[PDB]
Amino acid sequence: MAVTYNPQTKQFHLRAGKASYVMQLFRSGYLAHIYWGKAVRDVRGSRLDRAFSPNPDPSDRTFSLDTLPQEYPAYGNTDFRSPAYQVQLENGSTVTDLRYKTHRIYKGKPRLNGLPATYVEHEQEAETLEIVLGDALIGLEVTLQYTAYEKWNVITRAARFENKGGERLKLLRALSMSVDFPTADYDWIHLPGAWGRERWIERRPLVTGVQAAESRRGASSHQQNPFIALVAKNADEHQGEVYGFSFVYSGNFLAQVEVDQFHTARVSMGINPFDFTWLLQPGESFQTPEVVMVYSDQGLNGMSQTYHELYRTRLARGAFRDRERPILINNWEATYFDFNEEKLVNIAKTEAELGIELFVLDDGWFGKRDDDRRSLGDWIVNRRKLPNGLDGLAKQVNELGMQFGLWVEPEMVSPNSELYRKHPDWCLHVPNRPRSEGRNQLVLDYSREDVCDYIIETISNVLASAPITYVKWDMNRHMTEIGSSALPPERQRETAHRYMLGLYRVMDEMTSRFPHILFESCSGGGGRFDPGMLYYMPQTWTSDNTDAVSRLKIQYGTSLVYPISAMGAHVSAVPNHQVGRVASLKARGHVAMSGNFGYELDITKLTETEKQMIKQQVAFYKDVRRLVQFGTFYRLLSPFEGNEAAWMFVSADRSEALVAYFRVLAEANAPLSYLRLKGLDPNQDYEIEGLGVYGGDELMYAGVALPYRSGDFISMMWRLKAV
Amino acid sequence: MAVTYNPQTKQFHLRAGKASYVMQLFRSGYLAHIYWGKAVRDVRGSRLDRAFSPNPDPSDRTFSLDTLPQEYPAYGNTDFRSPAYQVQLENGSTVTDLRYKTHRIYKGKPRLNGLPATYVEHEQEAETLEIVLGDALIGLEVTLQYTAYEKWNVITRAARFENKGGERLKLLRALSMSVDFPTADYDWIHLPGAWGRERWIERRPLVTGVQAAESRRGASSHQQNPFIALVAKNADEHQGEVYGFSFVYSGNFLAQVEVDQFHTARVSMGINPFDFTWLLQPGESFQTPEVVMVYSDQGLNGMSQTYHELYRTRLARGAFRDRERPILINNWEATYFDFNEEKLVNIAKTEAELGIELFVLDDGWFGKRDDDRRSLGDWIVNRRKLPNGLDGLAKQVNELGMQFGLWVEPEMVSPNSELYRKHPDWCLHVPNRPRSEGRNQLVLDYSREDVCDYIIETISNVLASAPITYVKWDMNRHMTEIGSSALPPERQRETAHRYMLGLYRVMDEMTSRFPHILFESCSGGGGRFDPGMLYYMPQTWTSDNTDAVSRLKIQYGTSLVYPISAMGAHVSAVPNHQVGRVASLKARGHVAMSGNFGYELDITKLTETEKQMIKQQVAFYKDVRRLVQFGTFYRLLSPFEGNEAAWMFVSADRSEALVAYFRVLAEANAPLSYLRLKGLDPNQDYEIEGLGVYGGDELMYAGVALPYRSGDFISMMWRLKAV
């Protein structure tokens, strides 16, 4: 929180939790990066003169922008490294020369225009530094925005551009931050994946050159999550230096590390410059989304725990932010599309009898929507299928003791829909080109006000028509032929970002209009599982893959950044679907109860003993839900490192914990296995259900001797309680 | 084959296949190791003078035995490295000083007294060098025996000790060979395991110090197979230098690499010196078992293919050496012990109808043997259970079209047996100590002639009583309290080796007495799967673990040394037993049909569709059996390196092949996979059943695009035939 500027040293010192982030003004208004790491009281701000690194000041051959470590570097006036931003002028030049002009420090944390951002509830929680840079010749101002939190090791960064000149300025690249580390002796971690296998942890040594994760899909994507980290060579889950970079944005991104000839590592992150430009007319401004930067010297768990608390309590919003989330059941595979009102209610009684709390109605309740082909965009209740509308169904579900929820997919329109026939120009498209389809549908142009107003109107008409208290908001394709008939040629490349701004406006309006609704975002599973979406909808469908073994990796990687409260995990029926696997009902429960728990099956196909297990799972999860959704989460064993996965949840006072252990392909006649715990009070004794009493110190330093077992999938869960 | 001695250079050059092995006489009769690698026409035989490496000849300070690379080094007169042998004299000294005396070269390959050994069928196949060493002071002679094969890159080595003096000599250590490599820039491979998981491949860098695999179990063991290899850092299955060391012995062994201060690698192998001594009275001799040394520069497949051909055709013996082996079914789990004659015959008709060729009768046919507790040693047919004896049962099985086989366990005796009550001193034991049991049984003292004669008599009485044409010879525990009441104190530590010599004599007699019997050795699965046993029984039960996934590793590692003809692999019923796994009947067939194929289940529990699959598996294996059991085997993908396993068999003329592919835990929405083949004619075109026609070159250089699939266990097999 404690942000200072020392006029003698011209140094900015941002103290965030137990971390320091230090910058310093250098020569004629350059802004240098000095340090970011464990908190220091002070740090004083060599060899900037290097062969083939040229001199911006002919009178001063002591430095180059090619060697000075910076906060917001440009290319073209002596730095040859990857720039944080680039601007093209009317004369075609791309040379810009920002210098420090002034700064201000204030308590609290500002909102970002049109954008999600971490926030504070009290000014005392953080302090913000704004450093105003300017290129006087062209009238370009860039304000670097920094916030340091008191309680957490969190620095947040963004940049705001403003054209204070009399000419057009075209932003070709506008990243949210850039930081030059003094060495490149780190591994990097990022989170690549695909549909059905999101956010695998990938750790790699750095190369001398560039390495990056990005999305060009108009959505943050299944393929790369907008998160990267630099980690010390020897750092692991429990110890060591880790620097995380998390982009609070749900569209295209670039997350990059470039290592230069002097083995310094430039980390940068922001809206993907690929296929992007932004035109600033005189007087216009551009605000980047923010990047949330976390430091820990307590390994990956230390970093994750920071993100979890920050994101759960100061990014997610609304009535359910700090509330236990309902155990839900999705009633899709009960019917695919095949539905009408008579079934649904008895089904709801069966589900209610098992203790399930929320009944969700899936796709095909609307219009002529009856495969992945039709009526998207026409959001009126198909009053054949539900003649009594949503109201009659919902109210009965409520009188059964369950909440009622609904699926929507408002960003899509079917070529065969009334909306498309009335307004074909309302989809993203480019002149004279075929309109490529994903799952037989097109993308609505949310860069347009009329489109957004129409969606707000139409979805509100549905949501206010029944006592709905949960909505799953799905988006099931990525953008092609990106353009808008409502933008001029010179702004066409703003389409993807304006689309996201439009979606953000729409979601902000929808969640405000319906404060009693828990919204869960979805994009073919976890295709937009990012901090930007979390600001609008406090939980997310983690993956369409609900296979127990597959979920071990998906949940483990997702937890690197995202709080368990946001991480949807459901028990589904087997034969599994994406993969093909058979694991016990017990086992799938064990994996799913390690997330935000729910069900995704046909209850009409269950044996009494199965429903009986489900009744027990539900009762069990209710007992540990506060611990799972709000406790401190520790990863113990990594499925990316072998055949085991293990993790645990610990209460704030360390008096209670829940431990989960998994092993795949356990061999015959195998060595005994052990599990060392973390996060307990070493001087406290704990009762482990079914295993007796152990010292916290015994559990952490010697570990639990795991009951010997062998088989295709071992799954164990234990509750711990201080004696 | 071509073994020469050059009197000018005093160099021995052994040319084996496409390899050279070169030694040279040095100074006053020392024998130096010069080279072992790819064949050279000649190789000429520095810095032997080193600080703290002392001089055996005071008049010659140019060398030390601590630095000279040797063939059969001793400790005590200047070499401080691990010795190949050690002898204690009556005066308590352990210093011995062997020097070269003479040598002889002859065509062919000798038999080894009391021992198995690779052999030749014609003198032209190999040549043998015997180098006679002697310590005149004590009258110790050691003859180093070397054989070089013409056709294969194979050098075999053993040593023969003889006391030509007038005092007692006690051998404390008598390894079969030792070789000093000039560098230690290799990895080593060995084959550790356990019951139910034999012969996992373990590859490790060398340490400066000693690393070794050994057995102290009186049996070669499940825990370490008597095989180690040195491999070039970059060597793999298909290319690179590999040196294999395979011990033709079934008892205790040591296989060791010691790297010294000058980073030379001494590889040695032989009877484990631990708990071993051998007393040589004047005039007595001791022959070590042999070690079979293979070189390849074509990677691990090149080495394995050499061992496979050598061991299948010039180690294994008897009528079935070159014969396709019967598809058998073991009728244990049909009954555990619960049996009598009425069932067995109808069972045999069902099995015969499916095309199965050999009916095997398991444990509990004898005496009072009805759990793992009783009557071992009493080998008379329990004529309650089989009133018509083995003859009536066997003859009916034969008239049904199947051969008849039997299980025996002749090395064990039950405390509750008549043998034990008549001769309790006939077990291995030490005076006044408790007799530890393994599976409620004791080990018979095969170091004793009376014991061995009794076993030969008793087992022969059974085997000649019926038209038996297959015997499984099992041994289900390891030795404790090793001793013999028939040896004096000074020879007690010879018990383990004399036991093995006794077993060898017994097995040699039994297989000669019953030339129409295919004998398969077994020791709780592959607990004595070694070249020593192969010389007596041409196939082996690979592992008690018949789980398909588990067998991928077991079979892959076993194939590193042992021919597929010897590698028993059976389809069993699921729930699997050691592990707990469910894989398709198709899948288990695929893994088992990649070995010497058979069945191990209860046919009375099979569905018609299952028997129908079995009928098809049997027909399929009959079609590819010659290719599997006698074709050239290539490992393609390693289950020790990831989730895939793949291998193939190619006919001698390369016109036919069988390819098998496996993958465990195939993820949803996975990358496409490919398989590149080996061993085909690149200019030939091949039809792959179910995939069309491909060039041999296409198959090997571009590979097969595998049909995309996902699931817990993927299993595929294809027949290839030249168009």
mmCIF file with all atom_site columns, N, CA, C and O in Angstrom, chain A residues 630-647:
data_model
loop_
_atom_site.group_PDB
_atom_site.id
_atom_site.type_symbol
_atom_site.label_atom_id
_atom_site.label_alt_id
_atom_site.label_comp_id
_atom_site.label_asym_id
_atom_site.label_entity_id
_atom_site.label_seq_id
_atom_site.pdbx_PDB_ins_code
_atom_site.Cartn_x
_atom_site.Cartn_y
_atom_site.Cartn_z
_atom_site.occupancy
_atom_site.B_iso_or_equiv
_atom_site.pdbx_formal_charge
_atom_site.auth_seq_id
_atom_site.auth_comp_id
_atom_site.auth_asym_id
_atom_site.auth_atom_id
_atom_site.pdbx_PDB_model_num
ATOM 1  N N  . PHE A 1 630 ? -13.873 -21.356 0.379   1.00 0.00 ? 630 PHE A N  1
ATOM 2  C CA . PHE A 1 630 ? -13.297 -20.176 1.019   1.00 0.00 ? 630 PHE A CA 1
ATOM 3  C C  . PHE A 1 630 ? -12.050 -20.417 1.842   1.00 0.00 ? 630 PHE A C  1
ATOM 4  O O  . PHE A 1 630 ? -11.446 -19.473 2.343   1.00 0.00 ? 630 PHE A O  1
ATOM 5  N N  . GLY A 1 631 ? -11.641 -21.672 1.968   1.00 0.00 ? 631 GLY A N  1
ATOM 6  C CA . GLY A 1 631 ? -10.436 -21.975 2.719   1.00 0.00 ? 631 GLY A CA 1
ATOM 7  C C  . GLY A 1 631 ? -9.171  -21.687 1.936   1.00 0.00 ? 631 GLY A C  1
ATOM 8  O O  . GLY A 1 631 ? -9.222  -21.332 0.760   1.00 0.00 ? 631 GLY A O  1
ATOM 9  N N  . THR A 1 632 ? -8.028  -21.817 2.592   1.00 0.00 ? 632 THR A N  1
ATOM 10 C CA . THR A 1 632 ? -6.746  -21.609 1.924   1.00 0.00 ? 632 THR A CA 1
ATOM 11 C C  . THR A 1 632 ? -6.392  -22.908 1.198   1.00 0.00 ? 632 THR A C  1
ATOM 12 O O  . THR A 1 632 ? -6.410  -23.977 1.805   1.00 0.00 ? 632 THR A O  1
ATOM 13 N N  . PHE A 1 633 ? -6.064  -22.819 -0.089  1.00 0.00 ? 633 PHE A N  1
ATOM 14 C CA . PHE A 1 633 ? -5.853  -24.006 -0.920  1.00 0.00 ? 633 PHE A CA 1
ATOM 15 C C  . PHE A 1 633 ? -4.360  -24.247 -1.092  1.00 0.00 ? 633 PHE A C  1
ATOM 16 O O  . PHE A 1 633 ? -3.623  -23.328 -1.430  1.00 0.00 ? 633 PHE A O  1
ATOM 17 N N  . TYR A 1 634 ? -3.924  -25.482 -0.852  1.00 0.00 ? 634 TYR A N  1
ATOM 18 C CA . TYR A 1 634 ? -2.528  -25.866 -1.019  1.00 0.00 ? 634 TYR A CA 1
ATOM 19 C C  . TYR A 1 634 ? -2.438  -27.019 -1.987  1.00 0.00 ? 634 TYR A C  1
ATOM 20 O O  . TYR A 1 634 ? -3.034  -28.067 -1.747  1.00 0.00 ? 634 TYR A O  1
ATOM 21 N N  . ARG A 1 635 ? -1.687  -26.847 -3.073  1.00 0.00 ? 635 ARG A N  1
ATOM 22 C CA . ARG A 1 635 ? -1.364  -27.971 -3.941  1.00 0.00 ? 635 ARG A CA 1
ATOM 23 C C  . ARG A 1 635 ? -0.216  -28.771 -3.330  1.00 0.00 ? 635 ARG A C  1
ATOM 24 O O  . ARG A 1 635 ? 0.745   -28.200 -2.822  1.00 0.00 ? 635 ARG A O  1
ATOM 25 N N  . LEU A 1 636 ? -0.341  -30.098 -3.322  1.00 0.00 ? 636 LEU A N  1
ATOM 26 C CA . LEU A 1 636 ? 0.667   -30.935 -2.668  1.00 0.00 ? 636 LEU A CA 1
ATOM 27 C C  . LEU A 1 636 ? 1.440   -31.805 -3.662  1.00 0.00 ? 636 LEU A C  1
ATOM 28 O O  . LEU A 1 636 ? 2.677   -31.851 -3.625  1.00 0.00 ? 636 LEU A O  1
ATOM 29 N N  . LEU A 1 637 ? 0.720   -32.502 -4.533  1.00 0.00 ? 637 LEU A N  1
ATOM 30 C CA . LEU A 1 637 ? 1.354   -33.352 -5.545  1.00 0.00 ? 637 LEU A CA 1
ATOM 31 C C  . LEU A 1 637 ? 0.779   -33.053 -6.925  1.00 0.00 ? 637 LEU A C  1
ATOM 32 O O  . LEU A 1 637 ? -0.443  -32.938 -7.094  1.00 0.00 ? 637 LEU A O  1
ATOM 33 N N  . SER A 1 638 ? 1.661   -32.962 -7.922  1.00 0.00 ? 638 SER A N  1
ATOM 34 C CA . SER A 1 638 ? 1.262   -32.482 -9.242  1.00 0.00 ? 638 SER A CA 1
ATOM 35 C C  . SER A 1 638 ? 1.086   -33.594 -10.263 1.00 0.00 ? 638 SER A C  1
ATOM 36 O O  . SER A 1 638 ? 1.999   -34.398 -10.481 1.00 0.00 ? 638 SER A O  1
ATOM 37 N N  . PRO A 1 639 ? -0.082  -33.623 -10.917 1.00 0.00 ? 639 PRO A N  1
ATOM 38 C CA . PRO A 1 639 ? -0.341  -34.615 -11.966 1.00 0.00 ? 639 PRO A CA 1
ATOM 39 C C  . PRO A 1 639 ? 0.448   -34.277 -13.228 1.00 0.00 ? 639 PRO A C  1
ATOM 40 O O  . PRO A 1 639 ? 0.448   -35.046 -14.187 1.00 0.00 ? 639 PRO A O  1
ATOM 41 N N  . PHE A 1 640 ? 1.124   -33.136 -13.234 1.00 0.00 ? 640 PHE A N  1
ATOM 42 C CA . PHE A 1 640 ? 2.001   -32.812 -14.356 1.00 0.00 ? 640 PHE A CA 1
ATOM 43 C C  . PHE A 1 640 ? 3.398   -33.361 -14.128 1.00 0.00 ? 640 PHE A C  1
ATOM 44 O O  . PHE A 1 640 ? 4.244   -33.285 -15.019 1.00 0.00 ? 640 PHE A O  1
ATOM 45 N N  . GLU A 1 641 ? 3.625   -33.912 -12.935 1.00 0.00 ? 641 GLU A N  1
ATOM 46 C CA . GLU A 1 641 ? 4.941   -34.408 -12.540 1.00 0.00 ? 641 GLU A CA 1
ATOM 47 C C  . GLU A 1 641 ? 4.985   -35.913 -12.301 1.00 0.00 ? 641 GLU A C  1
ATOM 48 O O  . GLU A 1 641 ? 6.039   -36.476 -11.990 1.00 0.00 ? 641 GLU A O  1
ATOM 49 N N  . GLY A 1 642 ? 3.842   -36.557 -12.446 1.00 0.00 ? 642 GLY A N  1
ATOM 50 C CA . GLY A 1 642 ? 3.749   -37.988 -12.221 1.00 0.00 ? 642 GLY A CA 1
ATOM 51 C C  . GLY A 1 642 ? 2.309   -38.435 -12.155 1.00 0.00 ? 642 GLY A C  1
ATOM 52 O O  . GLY A 1 642 ? 1.410   -37.705 -12.585 1.00 0.00 ? 642 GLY A O  1
ATOM 53 N N  . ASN A 1 643 ? 2.085   -39.631 -11.615 1.00 0.00 ? 643 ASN A N  1
ATOM 54 C CA . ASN A 1 643 ? 0.763   -40.245 -11.605 1.00 0.00 ? 643 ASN A CA 1
ATOM 55 C C  . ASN A 1 643 ? -0.112  -39.891 -10.402 1.00 0.00 ? 643 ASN A C  1
ATOM 56 O O  . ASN A 1 643 ? -1.214  -40.406 -10.272 1.00 0.00 ? 643 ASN A O  1
ATOM 57 N N  . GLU A 1 644 ? 0.383   -39.021 -9.533  1.00 0.00 ? 644 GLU A N  1
ATOM 58 C CA . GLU A 1 644 ? -0.375  -38.603 -8.357  1.00 0.00 ? 644 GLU A CA 1
ATOM 59 C C  . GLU A 1 644 ? -0.854  -37.165 -8.476  1.00 0.00 ? 644 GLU A C  1
ATOM 60 O O  . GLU A 1 644 ? -0.258  -36.353 -9.179  1.00 0.00 ? 644 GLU A O  1
ATOM 61 N N  . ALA A 1 645 ? -1.923  -36.852 -7.749  1.00 0.00 ? 645 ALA A N  1
ATOM 62 C CA . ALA A 1 645 ? -2.362  -35.472 -7.587  1.00 0.00 ? 645 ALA A CA 1
ATOM 63 C C  . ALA A 1 645 ? -2.862  -35.366 -6.167  1.00 0.00 ? 645 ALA A C  1
ATOM 64 O O  . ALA A 1 645 ? -3.530  -36.281 -5.664  1.00 0.00 ? 645 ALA A O  1
ATOM 65 N N  . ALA A 1 646 ? -2.528  -34.271 -5.498  1.00 0.00 ? 646 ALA A N  1
ATOM 66 C CA . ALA A 1 646 ? -2.978  -34.105 -4.122  1.00 0.00 ? 646 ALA A CA 1
ATOM 67 C C  . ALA A 1 646 ? -3.023  -32.633 -3.760  1.00 0.00 ? 646 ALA A C  1
ATOM 68 O O  . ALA A 1 646 ? -2.198  -31.830 -4.218  1.00 0.00 ? 646 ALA A O  1
ATOM 69 N N  . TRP A 1 647 ? -3.982  -32.289 -2.913  1.00 0.00 ? 647 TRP A N  1
ATOM 70 C CA . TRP A 1 647 ? -4.181  -30.903 -2.527  1.00 0.00 ? 647 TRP A CA 1
ATOM 71 C C  . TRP A 1 647 ? -4.998  -30.877 -1.251  1.00 0.00 ? 647 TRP A C  1
ATOM 72 O O  . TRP A 1 647 ? -5.538  -31.903 -0.834  1.00 0.00 ? 647 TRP A O  1
#
